[PDB]
Amino acid sequence: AYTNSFTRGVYYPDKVFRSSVLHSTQDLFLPFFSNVTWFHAIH
Amino acid sequence: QFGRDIADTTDAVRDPQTLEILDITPCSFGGVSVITPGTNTSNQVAVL
Ligand SMILES: *[C@@H]1O[C@H](CO)[C@@H](O)[C@H](O)[C@H]1NC(C)=O
């Protein structure tokens, strides 16, 4: 089973504080609206 | 520990002795223009 990841999976590529800017970076990110497997923990 | 500006320069640092954030503001500067009559008349000048 898969669900909609929406906009999850973005993390800070480094340890520099940045603010009020649009930054283009290439790194290992979760594709937006990609399928992520939905797991259960019952029974 | 460090912040950066659009130009990639440092905007602020955390003081390693006291954990506070300090801004760095470049010291006041500006152009200087000289208004002068020709040296064929007088050597007195004014500074703008
Ligand atoms: C997710 O899976 C659905 C059906 O399982 C499919 O229609 C859709 O194209 C998939 N999306 C992605 C981003 O893989």
Ligand SMILES: *[C@@H]1O[C@H](CO)[C@@H](O)[C@H](O)[C@H]1NC(C)=O
């Ligand atoms: C020395 O470093 C310690 C460690 O954080 C700090 O508590 C203290 O303020 C520092 N000493 C001075 C004089 O800043």
Ligand SMILES: *[C@@H]1O[C@H](CO)[C@@H](O)[C@H](O)[C@H]1NC(C)=O
């Ligand atoms: C220089 O000064 C002389 C006399 O003071 C004057 O006759 C001459 O026209 C001047 N030349 C210029 C270029 O100002």
